[PDB]
Every structure is written in C-alpha cells, then in structure tokens.
Write a protein that binds this ligand. Structure first.
Ligand SMILES: *C(=O)[C@@H](NC(=O)Cc1ccccc1)[C@@H]1N[C@@H](C(=O)O)C(C)(C)S1
Length: 641
C-alpha cells in the first residue's frame, strides 16, 4: 500500500504526458524492453504514439475509474476507463488494462500495444479513412445564395506551352491584356520556387465568360466557396480560408483539406456550416486486414443558414454608399427582420478565399477608410436623430409640452457663464419661438439642450434606461453594448445637454439604433432585430408612451414635407415618409482637424413595413446619407408594406 500510492501516481503521470502531446516523456516512464515487461524501447514507443495518435489527431486524453492493485513483489496491475477526441469525434468508454513494475526505487509501466488502443496486440496497425463534408450554404430570406460552394473556372498558364525567351515574352503580354492582369505579375507567378516547366501555375478566377486563350493559357474547373454579392455583403458574410495545422490542433474535428470561416457569419456559424467528417477508424492486423472498428459514421454535410437579409436590398444599400465610408441598416420594424446590413468601403471576399496577393491584402489593411470594419456593428454618436428619444422621454415625464414655445434668440446659447466659451449651437435664427414641431423640422439643438437640462439627469436616465443600453443583443454579430456615458453619472450639465441632442459620450451602433428607433413603428414597443429567419420575434413593451409616438411621428412627416425640413429632398419620392436627419461632429477621436458624420433615419409611417438607418463616417463636403436614400427607400416602400 505504501508503494500502491506511487503506482497510481505513475499511471496518472503517464496519461498526462499522452494528453499533453509529449510522447517522449510518456515513453520514458516505461520499463526496459523485455518479455512480460515493456514491449518496445523508449524510442519505439515514441514513434508508435506519434504515428497512431498523430494520424487520428488524438487530443484530450482523460481517464476515470482508476484502480491499482498488486500481484507480486514487483508486479502491480492497473486498469482504468478513458475517453479521447479524434478526427472522427470522441472515442468514449475505453477499457484499458496493464501492469506496473516496482524495481529498485521508482515505479514504471510495463508498456504494451494495448495502451495505444484497447484491443491492439503485438504488431497490429491502425488505419484511418475520412470523407470531407460539403460546407452548408448561407441564403437570404427568399432562398437567394449569399455564400455557397460552386464550380469556378480558374485561369492559369503552363510555362512549357509558352515560348522560348523571345516567343514566350510575347504571349505573356498577350495573356496579360486579354484578362486584365499585370504583365510584370504574370512573370512573378511563374517565378515562384514551387514552379516547374510543365506545371499549371494558377493566375485568377474568371467570374464571367471565358475570352480567347493565348499560347499557354488553360482553364481548369475547380470547386470553391463563392459569394454572389461580393463586396456588398463581405463584412456580414465574411470569408473562409485554408485550414492550418494550428486549427487542427485546437479542434481535430475540422477537415484538414477543408475551409474554415475566418470572419463574419462564415466564422460565426462555422460549426453548423462545416458539417461532420465521415469515415472509419479501425485496428488492422499485421498484414493490413481489419479486425476491430473503433469509430465509424457516415459523412454529414453542413446545414444551410437562412437569413432575414434581402439580397436586392443588401446590394442596393451598399451601392448607394458609393464606396464612401458608412453603413446602412434596413429592418421590418414590426418583426425586426434585418433586411440589409451594408458596410462601405468593402473588400472582395472571393479574392480573399481564392488566393490573394500580399499587396492587395496589405492595401485593405493600409487603407485609411478601413474596409474590414463592420460599421453596422461599430458604435457611433447617434447625432441629432437621438432628439426623437429625448423628446419622447420629455413628453412622457411631462417636461415637454408639444405646443409650448421656448424663446431661443440667436444661433448660440449657454446655461450660465460657468459653461465658459462652450455654447449649444443652432443652424438657423429665423424662428425665435420654438416648439417641438419646429425643433424637429429644423433640428434645433438649443431646444433639445434646454429641455434636457429642464428634465434633469434623473428623469432623462429613467427614460433612457428603458431602452437597450448595456444589453447584449442576441445576434450572431460581434458588437459591444450601447452606452449612455462612460460612467453612470454625467457629472456635467454640458455632457447632459450634449447627450440631449445625441453628441455626448453616447455610443450606439447602427443595428442598435434601428432597435431603439423601432418604438416609433410599434406605438412605443421596442422590437429587437433578428438576423436568422426561423427565430421568434422578441419585443419589449412600454419603452415610450404611445402618446409620445402619436405626437412625434406627425412631426417626423414634416421633416420631409415641410419646405425647410432637413430631409425635404426626400419629398421627391412621393411616398409616405417619416424621417429625422443628423450630423455629428467628432473632434480628434484619434487626432485630426475636424471630422463629421452624417445620419439618416426613415420609415413608412402608414404601414410600418420598413425602417432605415443610414450613416456616413468622415463624410466629404456636400455629402450626406439623405442624398443617397432615394433608391433604397423606393425599393423598401414597394416590396415591404
Ligand atoms: C444634429 O446632429 C445637429 N448637428 C449639429 O449641431 C452639428 C453640426 C454639424 C455640421 C453643421 C452644423 C451643425 C443638427 N442636425 C443636422 C442635420 O440634421 O443634418 C443639422 C446640420 C441640421 S444641425
């Protein structure tokens, strides 16, 4: 019993070395090679575990129900149950048996082939057959493909079928101008270290009709992931890349020959899309004939994922951004169906997944406008659009009377001289008697600032805490919860007023904005947005009063219909619109000289069919989200009542 304690420790140390992948330490715990002792030397045990466990990608060896007895002055037997993870799943309920050896002072293990796998005897071999699973598709709300696997034609050249130095240099220029490729880059491709004369060096993937093939140009059909919308949904969908050896070490169920989602929904739904590897893990005898099947199951393809996205709305929303920095979110506000999640500028997902040069990839990362950012999931200051919420809160707690006129003379105002040089600014001084309808049409920041200070921080945060601030939305998109300020108290009348017109320490991403503003399409009920089609419509009752909704929405119509409304350019559509524009100022967020973001909110006040929140980040002069909304508003109005 004094030595049985060391035997149970030796078996525990041996399993840990196998689990940790250090087969040399596990082999050094075995006795000398002899009959009725260890069956192989330390190096022979190392090369057998490295072969068998390495082939099946064994990871996470865990044991239980250990028992170590005695049988002689040196023969102590042990037994335990174990489970392990392989390329074909978990191998559980394994019965292991063996004997330890207590000689001299230390206790070792009489190694046997049955300690690799239970029923292995002598010179038995192990074989592994696998069949890769087909990756599932990502489809929109009407079944249109957003991410699928198809047969893409690949362009490539064979250096031997080119020329001889003089005739070769002519076809390189001929094959470069007929496919829009840099002639200096084609020579770069056939100059890689892996290239041989009679090899097919791939160049690009033709996404259309195949032109004329010069001397040495060949087209080979290959299978790969394809994104029909390309840039228009690259941030949302993402891309898949080659699976590396480090990916297999973290999850051996992955197919070494397959693709893995690197970003977007391809990565978020990688498990459901990649399926399960089929095949058989069996123990053969010395000749190679099967004698024991450890694991076997049929290949299961990946499940399709159906989104609430409208492909025609996703493409239109992205194209309307004209390559500028910004994003657009379109929802059906009564249910929360995310119709479009566009972010601009964007990258080419087909280029990323079908091989891309380190220059084009560095161009994406060195781009100042940062196309890799999912801007619909990035928090921004809401802008003057937030005045809708501030007004609704003031109407609910009785601070704001819709017909009461505040006297606002000039273009600047401050509470007292304690504000120093800071003054809430105004765009027009033509209306000195300002009511709620006037303040929403002209976007009067002074009105919102005075009513917020009159409301007070306590009453303002009471209505704000009824929204989704600090909540993690149940969406497969990585985002941080919205915030009112950095701390739980403004501790500043200036910050309280700035938050009043949506320009304080507020941080709300476009998706969360569409969630908050949905109260104006559901009589004060907040409807959470959903991206997966089969999910249930979750809402939140009594966020703002229905009395406030029936007061603000008529004024939001006037933001479009009134001749001095900030969204009057949208009245050309001739459709029922309720809108609220916004322009936020960001001063040296990193460091600059003054950048401003443009915002637009709009929805149908008659049928509540659609809702839209578009924005431009670091906008150019005379550019805005309202300028670019006619096309998307037209489509959403006709197709979503
Ligand atoms: C809300 O966002 C308000 N914006 C400002 O006070 C900042 C600003 C930025 C550029 C020029 C002037 C003022 C108001 N809303 C916007 C808008 O709705 O477009 C206005 C420009 C009307 S000021």
């Amino acid at each position: 019993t004094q030595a049985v304690e060391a035997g149970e420790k030796t078996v525990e140390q041996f399993v840990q070395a196998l689990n940790k992948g250090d087969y040399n330490k596990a082999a050094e715990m075995t006795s000398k090679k002899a009959a009725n002792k260890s069956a192989l030397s330390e190096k022979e045990i190392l090369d057998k575990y490295q072969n068998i466990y390495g082939a099946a990608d064994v990871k996470g060896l865990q044991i239980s129900n250990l028992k170590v007895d005695k049988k002689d002055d040196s023969t102590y037997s042990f037994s335990y149950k174990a489970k392990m993870n392989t390329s074909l799943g978990e191998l559980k309920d394994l019965s292991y048996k063996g004997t330890l050896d207590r000689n001299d002072g230390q206790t070792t293990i009489n190694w046997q082939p049955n300690l690799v796998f239970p029923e292995m005897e002598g010179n038995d071999k192990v074989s592994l057959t696998t069949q890769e699973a087909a990756r599932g598709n990502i489809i929109d709300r009407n079944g249109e493909p957003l991410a699928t696997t198809g047969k893409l034609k690949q362009l490539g050249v064979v250096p031997s079928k080119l020329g001889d130095g003089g005739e070769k240099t002519a076809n390189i220029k001929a094959i470069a101008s007929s496919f829009d490729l840099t002639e200096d880059a084609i020579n770069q491709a056939i100059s890689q270290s892996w290239v041989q004369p009679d090899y097919f060096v791939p160049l690009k993937i033709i996404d259309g009709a195949t032109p004329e093939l010069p001397a040495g140009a060949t087209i080979q059909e290959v299978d790969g992931r394809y994104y029909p919308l390309g840039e228009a949904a690259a941030q949302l969908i993402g891309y898949v890349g080659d699976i590396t050896a480090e990916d297999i070490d973290k999850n051996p169920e992955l197919s070494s020959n397959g693709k893995i989602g690197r970003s977007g929904l391809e990565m978020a739904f990688d498990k459901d899309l990649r399926g399960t590897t089929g095949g058989k893990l069996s123990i053969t005898d010395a000749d190679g004939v099967e004698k024991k099947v450890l694991i076997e199951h049929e290949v299961q393809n990946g499940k399709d994922i159906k989104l609430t996205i409208d492909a025609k709305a996703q493409k239109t929303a992205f194209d309307s951004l004209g390559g500028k920095a910004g994003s657009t979110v379109a929802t059906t506000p009564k249910t929360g169906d995310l119709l479009a999640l566009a972010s601009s500028p964007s990258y080419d997902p087909n280029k990323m997944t079908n091989g891309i040069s380190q220059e084009d990839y560095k161009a994406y990362e060195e781009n100042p406008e940062q196309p890799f950012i999912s801007r619909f999931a990035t928090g921004y200051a809401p802008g003057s659009t937030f005045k809708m919420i501030t007004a609704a809160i003031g109407l609910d707690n009785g601070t704001i009377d819709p017909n009461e006129v505040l006297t606002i003379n000039g273009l600047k105002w401050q509470k007292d001289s304690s504000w120093g040089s800071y003054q809430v600014t105004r765009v027009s001084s033509d209306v000195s008697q300002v009511d709620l309808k006037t303040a929403l049409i002209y976007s009067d920041n002074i009105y919102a600032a005075q009513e917020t200070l009159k409301m007070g921080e306590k009453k303002f945060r009471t209505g704000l805490d009824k929204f989704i601030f600090g909540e993690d939305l149940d969406l497969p998109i990585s985002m941080n919860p919205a915030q009112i300020s950095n701390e739980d108290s403004f501790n500043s009348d200036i910050l309280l007023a700035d938050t009043g017109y949506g320009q304080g320490e507020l941080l709300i991403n476009p998706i969360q904005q569409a969630a908050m503003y949905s109260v104006f399409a559901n009589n004060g009920t907040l409807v959470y947005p959903k991206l997966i089609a089969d999910k249930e419509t979750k809402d939140k009752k009594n966020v703002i009063g229905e009395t406030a909704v029936q007061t603000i929405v008529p004024d939001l119509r006037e933001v479009v219909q009134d001749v001095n409304g900030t969204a009057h350019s949208l009245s050309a559509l001739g459709i029922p619109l309720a809108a609220k524009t916004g322009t936020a100022e960001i001063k040296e967020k990193q460091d600059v000289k003054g950048k401003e973001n443009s915002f637009l909110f709009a929805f149908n006040p008659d049928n509540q069919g659609y809702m839209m929140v578009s924005m431009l980040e670091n906008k150019e002069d005379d550019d805005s989200a309202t300028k670019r909304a006619s096309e998307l508003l037209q489509y959403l109005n006709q197709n979503y009542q």
